[PDB]
Amino acid sequence: RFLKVKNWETDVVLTDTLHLKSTLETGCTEHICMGSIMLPTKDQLFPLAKEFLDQYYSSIKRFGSKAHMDRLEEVNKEIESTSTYQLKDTELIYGAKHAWRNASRCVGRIQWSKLQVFDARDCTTAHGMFNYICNHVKYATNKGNLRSAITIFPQRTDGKHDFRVWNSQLIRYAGYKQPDGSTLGDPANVQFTEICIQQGWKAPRGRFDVLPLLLQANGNDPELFQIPPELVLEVPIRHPKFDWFKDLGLKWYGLPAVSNMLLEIGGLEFSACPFSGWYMGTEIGVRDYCDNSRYNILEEVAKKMDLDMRKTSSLWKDQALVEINIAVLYSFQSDKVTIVDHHSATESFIKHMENEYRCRGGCPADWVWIVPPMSGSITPVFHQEMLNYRLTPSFEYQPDPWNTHVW
Amino acid sequence: RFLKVKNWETDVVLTDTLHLKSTLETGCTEHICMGSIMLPVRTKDQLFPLAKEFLDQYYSSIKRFGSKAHMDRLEEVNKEIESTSTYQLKDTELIYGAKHAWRNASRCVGRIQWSKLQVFDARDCTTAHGMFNYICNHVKYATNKGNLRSAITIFPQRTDGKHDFRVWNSQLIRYAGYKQPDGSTLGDPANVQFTEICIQQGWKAPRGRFDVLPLLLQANGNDPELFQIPPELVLEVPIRHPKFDWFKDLGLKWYGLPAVSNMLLEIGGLEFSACPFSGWYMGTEIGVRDYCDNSRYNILEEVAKKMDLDMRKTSSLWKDQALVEINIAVLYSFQSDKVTIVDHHSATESFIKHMENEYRCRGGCPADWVWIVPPMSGSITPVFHQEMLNYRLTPSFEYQPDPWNTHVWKG
Ligand code: HEM
Ligand code: HEM
Ligand SMILES: Cc1cc(N)nc(COC[C@H]2C[C@H](OCc3cc(C)cc(N)n3)CN2)c1
Ligand SMILES: Cc1cc(N)nc(COC[C@H]2C[C@H](OCc3cc(C)cc(N)n3)CN2)c1
Ligand SMILES: C[C@H](O)[C@H](O)[C@H]1CNc2nc(N)[nH]c(=O)c2N1
Ligand SMILES: C[C@H](O)[C@H](O)[C@H]1CNc2nc(N)[nH]c(=O)c2N1
Ligand SMILES: [Zn+2]
Known about the structure:
The structure is a homodimer.
Chain A: E1 3-6, E2 13-16, H1 42-59, H2 66-82, H3 89-101, E3 116-119, H4 126-141, E4 149-152, E5 164-165, E6 175-177, E7 183-185, H5 190-198, E8 213-216, E9 223-225, E10 234-236, E11 251-253, E12 257-258, E13 262-265, E14 268-270, E15 275-276, E16 279-280, H6 281-290, H7 298-304, H8 316-334, E17 339-340, H9 342-360, H10 367-370, E18 394-396
Parallel strand pairs in A: 3-4, 16-17
Antiparallel strand pairs in A: 1-2, 4-15, 5-8, 6-7, 8-9, 10-11, 12-15, 13-14, 13-18
Bound molecules: protoporphyrin IX containing FE (2 copies), the ligand Cc1cc(N)nc(COC[C@H]2C[C@H](OCc3cc(C)cc(N)n3)CN2)c1 (2 copies), 5,6,7,8-tetrahydrobiopterin (2 copies) and zinc ion (ZN).
Keywords (chain A): Calmodulin-binding, Cell membrane, Cell projection, FAD, Flavoprotein, FMN, Heme, Iron, Membrane, Metal-binding, NADP, Oxidoreductase, Phosphoprotein, Synapse, Ubl conjugation
Binding site for L-arginine (chain A): 169, 278-279, 283
GO molecular function (chain A): ATPase binding; cadmium ion binding; calcium-dependent protein binding; calmodulin binding; enzyme binding; flavin adenine dinucleotide binding; FMN binding; heme binding
């Protein structure tokens, strides 16, 4: 019930008590651990509202005060009457910051309290959503000096009037299936690219085409918009040693901005809540570039380096991997676009864990996601035991809306 | 109940039914996942069900389930338990049991090899000197002049828990570590405490950076005794790099035979507290963890210095760069001396084929992702992208506490 986590590199032991507030379920049982599985009414709503308002009022040292009680009373009256309620601005901001704070898969949470929250609950149309999103993108990008932000569209009502951003991120590259069987551009987005084409998009059919936004207001059929090219900051990828690297013609965008997730605050559901931070280098240079089902560039790079590609034991893949990641970091740094490397990010997260243990009694963390996809054991997170559990407010996966939308 | 796992690179979906036969606990609940926690005297009472389950599995493996031979063996074990409180495995059941403990070991990426295991039955052993002889024979056999063969040696099972056989070493071959008065460590920091026990017990320490530890061996619950493995039986590989000629001058070497000697083998409810087993190395065990962990030999700085990488900012990835070079060197050195070793690409690829085969023929393959994924280049190996289900099957290998914490000294 009071659980210990040990760092095996430093012997530091931390005691977790926060897990006892865990509300949602993990997918694991005493018989089976699902740690590596990617996805494991009025009556319902009032406990959720209360649980949230209690933690909110406690956070501002006003637990058990009239202002606390009064707000419980008010929301209670409002649910009874309307079957939902509206968060105060102060609650919305707190809820959103805490959804990031509770995100067990996020290595970047030392930053959780510096989050700019844009309240878009007055939005009514896809054009309005487009406006709010462009403003988000420009604010967060800040000419390369990136700032964390989330834009929150109106909450779910009857569930037939959902706001959704159909894109998985605000900024991603198209993927095209070709005659010759191969894939041009990002194969992860092939399907979404086709949904764009079939909804009208005129695609340039290149390797790095910024996708248009496909926005759904109020349960209506979604609409297409091109983000002003001028608001999409990109980095050409070169290497500080290898002159030929630039010839590969690689680039990536500066703003990572997840747009397909659902924010839950005090029982309320915000199905459109695009949020953004900045990149850790490996996301681009290890996953985006080197996954076999992504840009899959290792072969071409290793070839340019003239490595012995005959045998897996020459570690040519590993060699090329490092260099590609050196180039990503170098290019963002040279163009002055905020980026963090995995050494620096994981060291920060260990510091954050210690802060959260001291100040909050724990920190939910998902080791499988927190350890970088390269050089795992040479980052301190590898040696750090983590307890994973679900706290609310939260971000949650939600199914892609084309599998749901009634047209 | 059926459970599905998905590979996110290939979209291949597998269906696990094997998990229905698990009963030992995971550490996890519906409310907490303990998947990255390193660690999340039996009565007749509990023993006959454990024996019966085991013999049912053994008898099925041989297509003799429900046979007269199956039934007679159940009746024979049952009587033996009730009259002696324990029982003895037949040789065939010992072999099968040891093989399955390996097969069931969810942290082991090498399991494609599970059915090729040489089992040495040391249950007639009575003294520490006898244990020393068995262990030397196991080292020589497994080593096979560099052409490594997997093996396990199985000493007598636990009886009352006061008569335990234990190998006090964590591995049969490992290097000494010495804490110096100035706070630095000479040799392997992981073995400082065990090294100090060896010295205390009378070992004359050479005090260098790679001194092979003496064996410290407990038979029949007696005080453990020290033995030096004959050096001619300890195969070692000097580490050099195919391109960097100063790499040899770091003075690195490692032993070829990875042989775990501190775990507990459970078969049919019986407990074999000394059961050293050995395979061959995956390169990263040495090049990543042994050499480059901060709490081990910690050579990243010296290697990167010699490489003259930019060391003033982590974002040069000097650590990553030096890490790959060291690992190339380890694989090169082993291959050049004709000592079996596997790289992490080859090992993980084989593990995926093993795991798929297991799903088809066996209905599952319990696997601990946290351990299976190699400690460098994680996502360029196929296991990173493979969903896994972790659960506990018996027969099994289990952690047990270090014996110096529990041993009752005689003097
Ligand atoms: C400030 C810079 C940030 C860095 C460096 C960072 C780092 C990361 C990394 C490396 C991942 C793993 C995701 C992957 O591999 O695809 C991650 C996941 C996640 N992050 Fe953060 N993050 C940052 C900002 C944020 C912000 C501002 C939020 C919310 C407001 C957030 C919420 C999450 C969530 C919900 C996940 C899991 C996404 C999923 O399940 O696919 N991140 N982040
Ligand atoms: C044949 C060559 C083998 C290779 C390349 C192999 C590879 C590995 C690796 C990389 C690990 C993770 C251990 C670590 O990082 O410290 C491991 C763990 C394990 N292996 Fe295998 N293995 C092999 C043979 C065997 C054999 C023969 C057995 C037993 C008969 C075995 C049983 C285990 C067990 C019980 C663990 C967990 C260790 C622990 O929890 O500390 N392995 N092995
Ligand atoms: C906010 C933020 C900052 C930063 N530096 N990086 C990120 C990356 O998160 C992107 C999101 C999109 C992919 O989604 C994978 C995924 C798939 C599925 C089926 C479920 C799930 N939870 N996650 C991986 N994580 C997000
Ligand atoms: C048989 C074999 C072959 C091969 N190539 N590699 C191995 C490696 O297993 C070595 C063993 C020793 C360390 O054990 C650490 C450890 C500590 C604790 C507290 C528990 C636990 N299960 N394991 C890591 N695994 C074993
Ligand atoms: C199957 C496994 O859970 C899956 O590949 C995970 C592993 N760890 C990950 N870690 C991060 N940060 N991002 C990912 O997409 C994944 N994928
Ligand atoms: C705390 C964490 O679980 C611990 O560092 C584990 C992680 N994964 C591992 N994986 C392997 N193969 N070996 C290890 O020692 C570890 N250590
Ligand atoms: Zn679990």
